[PDB]
Write a protein that binds this ligand. Sequence first.
Ligand SMILES: *c1ccc(O)c2ncccc12
Ligand SMILES: *c1ccc(O)c2ncccc12
Ligand SMILES: [Cs+]
Ligand SMILES: [Cs+]
Ligand SMILES: [Cs+]
Ligand SMILES: [Cs+]
Ligand SMILES: [Cs+]
Ligand SMILES: [Cs+]
Ligand SMILES: [Cs+]
Ligand SMILES: [Cs+]
Ligand SMILES: [Cs+]
Lengths: 222, 225
Amino acid sequence: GEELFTGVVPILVELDGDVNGHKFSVRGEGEGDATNGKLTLKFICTTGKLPVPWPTLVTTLVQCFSRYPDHMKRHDFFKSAMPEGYVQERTISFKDDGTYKTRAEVKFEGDTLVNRIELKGIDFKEDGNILGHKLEYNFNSHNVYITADKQKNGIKANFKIRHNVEDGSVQLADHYQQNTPIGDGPLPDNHYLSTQSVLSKDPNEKRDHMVLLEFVTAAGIT
Amino acid sequence: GEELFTGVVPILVELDGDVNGHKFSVRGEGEGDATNGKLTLKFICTTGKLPVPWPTLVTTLVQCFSRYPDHMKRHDFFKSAMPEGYVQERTISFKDDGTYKTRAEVKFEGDTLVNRIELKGIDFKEDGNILGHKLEYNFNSHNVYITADKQKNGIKANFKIRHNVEDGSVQLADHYQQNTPIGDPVLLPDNHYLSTQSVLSKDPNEKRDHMVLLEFVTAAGITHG
Ligand SMILES: *c1ccc(O)c2ncccc12
Ligand SMILES: *c1ccc(O)c2ncccc12
Ligand SMILES: [Cs+]
Ligand SMILES: [Cs+]
Ligand SMILES: [Cs+]
Ligand SMILES: [Cs+]
Ligand SMILES: [Cs+]
Ligand SMILES: [Cs+]
Ligand SMILES: [Cs+]
Ligand SMILES: [Cs+]
Ligand SMILES: [Cs+]
């Protein structure tokens, strides 16, 4: 599938979410360069104010843009499932707080890469770090370990994401990730990805938004 | 002094370190844009394989290229020391491990911003996160609290750097930083903070132990202003 990702590919992300009843929608437009492992996107909240902090939606808001080095091309599941695409289902548990439950489809629609997502956050408490909006405008992770699930013909990943809290503490986010191809065609070994995220604001944007620049690279101590 | 950083300024970094007896040198070339708070550099180890993981040297490998907002220009200590420059002394205590001790001079040689540092690390353990090289190739986002030292006509800062470890844990690096002008008039700031976001990458066309660093630093904390 590593064919349609040479050159720059336009990205559209659509998310419809519901956290504790608070229903919202986010639309992100941009473009990705898998050759350089580069993502340049801009998300806005189409419905109004975002009920959760932007960093909390980073993991949910296209791993098919990660740069796989030429000697690790056998590890690329994300590209392989294209243009048929894959389904990314996730469960994100926030320590001492609520839980995100996401289901998304990442596929090629025309010559534009699309990530369409349904999100259901429940049992979220306040003050907290999510509903109370006390997470800083940044993002830290790594390194994410991807395994193959040959029993479902997809991949499984489990990782811990630490969100920096404004007081100086740390908000834990346990990600349990499952990916399963839509079509049939394409099974990687134990490898890790290395995305690096930087968050900013559009000075000419008076709405709720997040400008995301990202650097994803595949690597492996094997 | 701030008018020296309008536009793109070339940057030369030179780091000479000694960790547990292991001597090493790092040479960095790049350019910085203080208006956008952008910072592009490339560091190489000219003495061979780096004895320490790259992330631990990022904090020591030029805060005069940070983006200060229009209303906080009067609180920009770093640019006001230019072109004569400033001295930046640091003690970095790694929790349950050794300690870096650094002293740097950041000044304008010709039309080039040069950071010449001296590093000495002691009491590091071999099977630890640093000498055992257990740290992941990244760098977390941070918020530094910059305060004014009116007794040294300079500034003070103390912060916590979290380096990611391979086993899914965190290696804490406690930084103690003090910046002093030469004397020689400098702007002493009010209580404010810097926000830092870095990205480390490699050059595939380099066969030497290196680090390609991209960095975005912005200033905030003062209410208008
Ligand atoms: C997805 C998007 C951005 C990140 O920084 C990231 N880190 C770790 C795992 C997944 C992921
Ligand atoms: C210097 C460079 C990059 C960083 O991320 C950083 N963080 C905190 C203090 C200093 C510093
Ligand atoms: Cs743009
Ligand atoms: Cs939970
Ligand atoms: Cs499951
Ligand atoms: Cs040499
Ligand atoms: Cs290293
Ligand atoms: Cs120590
Ligand atoms: Cs980062
Ligand atoms: Cs001191
Ligand atoms: Cs002096």
